Amino acid sequence: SQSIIAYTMSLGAENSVAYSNNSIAIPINFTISVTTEILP
C-alpha cells in the first residue's frame, strides 16, 4: 500500500505563545541532558 508523496516542507511544530506584560513562565523541574556532537 506504500507510495512516494511530495509536499511543501513545514518548518516544524507551530507555537503561538501566551505573552503578557505581567505574566512569566518559570521552570519547577529540569532535565540533565547529554547530547553527542561529532567533528572531523
Partner: protein, 314 residues
Amino acid sequence: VSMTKTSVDCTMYICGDSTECSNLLLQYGSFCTQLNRALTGIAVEQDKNTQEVFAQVKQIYKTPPIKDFGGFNFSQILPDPSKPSKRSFIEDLLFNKVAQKFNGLTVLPPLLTDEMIAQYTSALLAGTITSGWTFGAGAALQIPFAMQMAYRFNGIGVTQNVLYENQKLIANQFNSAIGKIQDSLSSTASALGKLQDVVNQNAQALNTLVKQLSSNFGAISSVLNDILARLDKVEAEVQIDRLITGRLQSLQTYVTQQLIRAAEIRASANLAATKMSECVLGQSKRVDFCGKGYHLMSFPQSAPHGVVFLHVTY
C-alpha cells in the same frame, strides 16, 4: 550565507550537439562525473548554510496581536500582513537593493524559498521579544519584554533599577534607533553592498565561463557546428580536441574559483550561525562581537543570499 547555486554540464558546455565531440570527451575519463560532483557538492551546501543559520529553533513562534511591549516599537521588524510576502518593512527593503538557459549553464533553486527563510526569521524574532533567551536553552517561557530588557542591563553590569527608572527614554531611544536605520537603508546602497559584492563575483565568474566558449585555442573556429560543416570527421578532430582541451581548462578553473569561494561563503555562513546563536538566542559578553558597545539583544533580518543582524547595544 548562501551564494547563487549553479550547475554546468561538461556534455552541453564542451559539446554543443556533436557525438564526435562527445566521444572525444569520453577520451579523458572521469573528469565530467567529477565536475558534476564538484558543483553538486556546492549546491547541496548552500542549502546547508541556510539551514545552519536559520534552523536554530525547532518550533515556529508567532507574535501576539497586541503590542504590549512597554514602549518598544518592533513593528518595523515583525511581519507586515499587507504585503503578499510575510516580511517586515526592513526585510522588504533588503530585496529592493540586492526555466533553463542556452549552453548548459543553469541556476538551481534554494531548498528554502525566501518566504520560508523570512518565516524562520519572524519565529526567531517572536521568540526573542517574548521568550527571553529560553527558547534557545530549552522550552519557550514568556517574560514581560521590559523585564527581559532588565535582565540584559543586569547582564552588562548595570543595576536593573536604571531600566525601570528610565524605560521611557530607553524606548524613545530604541524607537529612534530602529527609525535611523530605516532612513540610512532607504537611500544608501553600500550598507548592503557586501551581498552585492558576492553576487557580482558569481556573475563575473559566469560571464567568464560563457566568454570562454568563444575561444579558438588554435582551432579554425570557436564554434563546433562551423567546424563539422566544413571539415570531414577525421581531420576535424585536430580542431575539436583543441576546443576540448581549451574548454576543459575553462571548467577546471571555473570550478576552482567556485570551490574556493564556496569555502569563503561557508566561513561567512558558520560565522553567521555563531552570531545567530550568541547574539539572537542569547546575550554575549564577547566585546564588540554583536556590534560595537555593550550588547543587549539582536534581531535577525532576511536578505538575498544572507542574514542581517540588527544588534542593540548600550
